Design a protein around this ligand. Structure first.
Ligand code: CU
Ligand code: CU
Ligand code: NA
Ligand code: NA
Lengths: 620, 620
């Protein structure tokens, strides 16, 4: 059995049984996170030990625990009681989504605010929102959620159309108390609906779209073995799934002749945060760590054939744990298919008379998740020519507010009285590199402009310079789009046939990084988001750029603390963390449901191969 | 008949007849460029006048002419004798491609250089390369080409594998004289072949690719009427074709309810240049204006069904003129099809219970051209949601040199002894804007970071600032990727239902612009390439950023001279010129034939619509 196989239902049940037998999973306990751990370096031969890590919440007020179990051996490896005021609260539990609204519905201050606005409490939905860390001392060590109100005129109404501005509440979800209700003033509740399946708003549906049929009459060119091992057009990898990160790729390698050459040991989106830029106190605290606080894998959609995934689709249905340790399958949660990708290479040569055209293809591994109003697709692509790409597709319904009478520098108007606060969606890709194996380094490569003069008399020359990042203290880097800045991951001990180090070049989109003031809470809690590229020395406990417990965790842990170790990264087992985000000034076209917009990055081979790796692609 | 229809064979013949009857097209004359002119502003009602512009070369040494004819009326509108030392030489003629090699084959200096290197003259191919303007006074007013030598070991060999470095020659293609032969020293001629259809180099061809079938059982959702008028998913446009620019898009508009709203009046790639960054005198003069010097439309490939264009394809076969004024069809030179484009919009709403998914599509209009060693695909995309995108796909065989013994700061190694000089491929997109009609302006929009303090106590706020470009003197702009800089084209007299000006936002890729020293010849001749964005007032004679006659034209004309008029662009008929390029440090994977790499830009509606324009898209 591959140590990188997906968790099975039975493994989850065994975790549940081990915890129960150990006294760690009584009736007051709730699992907030559960996932398999990756194999240790050098374990491959042989003795598998499948370990699972668990964060256990306690609804009676006792301290939560972090536990690692061996499902192979039926044992508890470690169990530690957590002090959440110090190391952070556990991820938000799905069962807490409804608690915020329920507690507020009987609170006299909340009821007073709603009555002043002539809103029926039974129609008022409350978004259960992560709290962060601000000035409220009573929240330290307590599990808090904040609530913003949205009116549903009827049960199938889009409540996002009807934000209740001027009002926010804070709730202790363990003691089941409402800590604060803040009402700064009434705002009109926007009147128009945003019901994008209502014929009155859509108009007559188009009849002009003729069908498109994508089929594979001999089936797909990729095979799946061992549950999640992919072989496709010389690529080899394993598709993992973690309730926090979502789809994870392991052991990305390329068969070059008859050697299996590693490229990336683990690829994931290790954090994704949505900071808001509206200074109103109703929302200025708002920063949604979709990955670290809510767990994006947990909310993966079941993807329907034809509608969500077009073509010849192979599905994985990953297993996660519910809050009690029972396995739950996410049916059709991962889509895998191969797609045509236009022209790969083409040349019509006058002198030889030979005309040559070849087509490209990509392997696609994706999932789609829903976090409140947001919906995101996470796509990994592998191309015939060795390129690796990630793309996020952001859609859903924009988070709304009132639109202030005199306008706003921090909010867009979408409809009469309806606003959408400015925000960013910022991702961290954690790429545990293995370029031709684990001995790797990173160089920053800039274009170099040259002055007209001796040695360059016509002023045409230009060049490039590479700077080796030798230690972690030197490996916090920013974009420089103007100088074409990229980062090359190479293996200094593996040379191609031209005696040059094999490598892969990371091409970033160079979008803005975190805009918040450097002194803000979010700049400290999401320090990773302030820089485009970080390199660390591999360490099995350094998994997320924000640390293990992001919820209400005050700042510092994660990448800035890892980097302080100032470890050697010059020909060592290293990890690249790439920050990339979308800055979203909402547009009217984003309302009532937003068209997809994208952000991502790609890596291309750079002297990894001895010549083009796609010379053996056939015509047709 | 639409005044924007493609030229017909008969129209070309009529130009030929008008010129002949006027005394302008005798036996010594050769047509270097011929194309229809666009209709004048306000002509639409009615009286069509189809005019064609012609550049006429004279092989006997007489001065060339620029002529405009009316094929409607059978008349010569204007005919002007050109002074090429002042205003530039005419575009390279296809018949001159072979002349450089032929003249050199009997030149004793060339023969001496080849004999020193033991090369058989019959095997030596000579790339016919544009000359530019450097220190050689005798070239002023003469039609010069420069030649670089490549060995073909046999007739179906790839000569690019065997550059002859240290050697360059200059030729007067009218007087049929060799002006200079420069031999700076022998370099080994690289020995390996680059024959990408040789089984010895490809290895056994893959058998792993299973078929992909893309079909449309009811045909495509777009119609073509009037030869080149497209209607597709609310878009309306006309597809033009010009021998210089290639595919051109006219009258891009969107049917919003029952109004046809204009967006872009004319879209084209109005220049594309390839500057080289190797300071060796063998190549330091090298700058290939594929569009302005060679005419990319002229060399458009015939695109084969299945191999070049996959799916349900509708072809246009544009007509151009040969050197004598006879019409010539480029069979299957333009591909049109619609393609699935993944998820358009999706949201799974907990509170309403409604799960909603819709798919996107794009209309694709493309051609592929071959310029010596280079092959480029030009793609225009129209999406359901109003987005417009351009993409260039660069492939072919890299231009080679020797790889110097001690290495090189300006050349990559590809194979033993084989180099590829650093270079850029830099495009200019000329977008004659018509956002809701012709009264337009441009704003530069930057993200604005805000300081923590009063009014922003938590340091989370961020904003945006828009700067109106009021006159052409203010409208030469550079990228600022770090501040998320974009440019919005709006109609200040057309408001959406929220009382905000309708607009489209240009999203650039923010790649490096021209790297050459500002004092270089190429910085002067390709001044457009030094800045990302220019805005001019529309003028029917301001067609190319480099001017009308680029070949051996010394500098200044084009955009820097247009801009000096300092015309009002604040709510006027304006033209956006976007510079965007690929900076190419060749990689071993680019050899022997290069995988496609891409560059481009896109424009998205920004308050153009009153809400999402794709609410009427049906499921499935
Ligand atoms: Cu957003
Ligand atoms: Cu190139
Ligand atoms: Na590593
Ligand atoms: Na215009």
């Amino acid at each position: 059995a591959s140590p990188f196989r997906l968790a099975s239902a039975g493994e989850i049940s065994e975790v549940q049984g081990i915890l129960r037998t150990a006294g760690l999973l009584g009736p007051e306990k709730r699992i907030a996170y559960l996932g398999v751990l990756d194999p240790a370096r050098g374990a491959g031969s042989e003795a598998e030990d499948r370990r699972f890590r668990v964060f256990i919440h306690d609804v009676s007020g006792a301290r939560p625990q972090e536990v690692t179990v061996s499902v192979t051996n039926g044992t508890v490896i470690s169990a530690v009681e957590l002090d959440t005021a110090a190391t952070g609260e556990l991820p938000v539990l799905e069962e807490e989504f409804e608690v915020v609204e329920q507690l507020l519905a009987t609170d006299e201050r909340w009821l007073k605010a709603l009555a002043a606005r002539n809103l029926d409490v039974s129609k008022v939905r409350v978004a259960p929102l992560s709290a962060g860390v601000f000035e409220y001392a009573e929240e330290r060590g307590r599990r808090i959620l904040r609530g913003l109100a949205f009116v549903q005129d009827f049960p199938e109404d889009s409540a996002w159309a009807h934000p209740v501005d001027g009002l926010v509440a804070y709730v202790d979800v363990v003691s089941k108390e409402v800590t604060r209700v803040i009402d700064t003033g009434v705002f009109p509740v926007p009147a128009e609906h945003g019901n994008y399946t209502d014929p009155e708003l859509t108009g007559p549906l188009r009849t002009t779209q003729k069908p498109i049929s994508i089929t594979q009459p001999e089936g797909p060119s990729f095979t799946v073995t061992g549950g999640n091992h992919i072989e496709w057009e010389k690529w080899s990898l394993d598709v993992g799934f973690d309730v926090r990160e979502g789809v994870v790729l392991h052991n990305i390698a390329f068969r070059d002749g008859d050697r299996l050459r590693p490229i990336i040991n683990r690829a994931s989106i290790a954090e994704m945060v949505v900071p808001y830029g509206d200074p109103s106190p109703i929302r200025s605290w708002q920063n949604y760590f979709d990955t670290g606080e809510y767990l994006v894998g947990q909310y993966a959609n079941s993807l329907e054939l034809g509608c969500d995934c077009l073509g010849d689709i192979t599905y994985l249905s990953p297993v996660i744990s519910d809050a009690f340790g029972n396995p739950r399958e996410i049916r059709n949660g991962i889509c895998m298919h191969e797609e045509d990708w236009g022209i790969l290479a083409k040349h019509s040569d006058l002198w030889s008379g030979i005309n040559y055209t070849r087509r490209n293809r990509r392997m696609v591994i994706s999932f789609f998740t829903t976090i409140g109003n947001y919906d995101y697709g996470f796509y990994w692509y592998l191309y015939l020519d060795g390129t690796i790409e990630f793309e996020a597709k952001a859609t859903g319904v924009v988070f709304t507010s009132a639109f202030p009478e005199g306008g706003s520098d921090n909010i867009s108007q979408l409809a009469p009285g309806l606003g959408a606060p400015f925000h960013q969606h910022i991702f961290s890709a954690r790429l545990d590199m293995a370029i031709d194996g684990f001995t790797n380094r990173v160089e920053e490569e800039d274009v170099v402009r040259q002055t007209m003069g001796p040695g360059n008399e016509r002023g045409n020359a230009f060049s490039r310079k590479r700077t080796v990042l030798t230690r972690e203290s030197e490996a916090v880097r920013e974009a420089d789009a103007r100088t074409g800045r990229t980062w090359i991951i190479s293996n200094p001990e593996s040379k191609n046939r031209l005696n040059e180090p094999v490598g892969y070049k990371l091409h970033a989109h160079n979008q803005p990084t975190l805009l918040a003031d450097p002194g803000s809470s979010i700049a400290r809690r999401a320090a990773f988001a302030t820089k485009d590229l970080w390199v660390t020395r591999y360490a099995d406990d350094e998994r997320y750029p924000t640390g293990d417990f992001v919820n209400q965790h005050s700042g510092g842990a994660g990448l800035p603390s890892y980097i302080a170790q100032d470890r050697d990264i010059d020909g060592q087992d290293i990890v690249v963390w790439h920050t990339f985000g979308l800055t979203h000034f909402p547009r009217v076209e984003d309302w009532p449901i937003m068209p997809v917009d994208t952000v991502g990055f790609k890596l291309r081979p750079e002297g990894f191969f001895d010549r083009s790796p796609v010379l053996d692609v056939p015509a047709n």
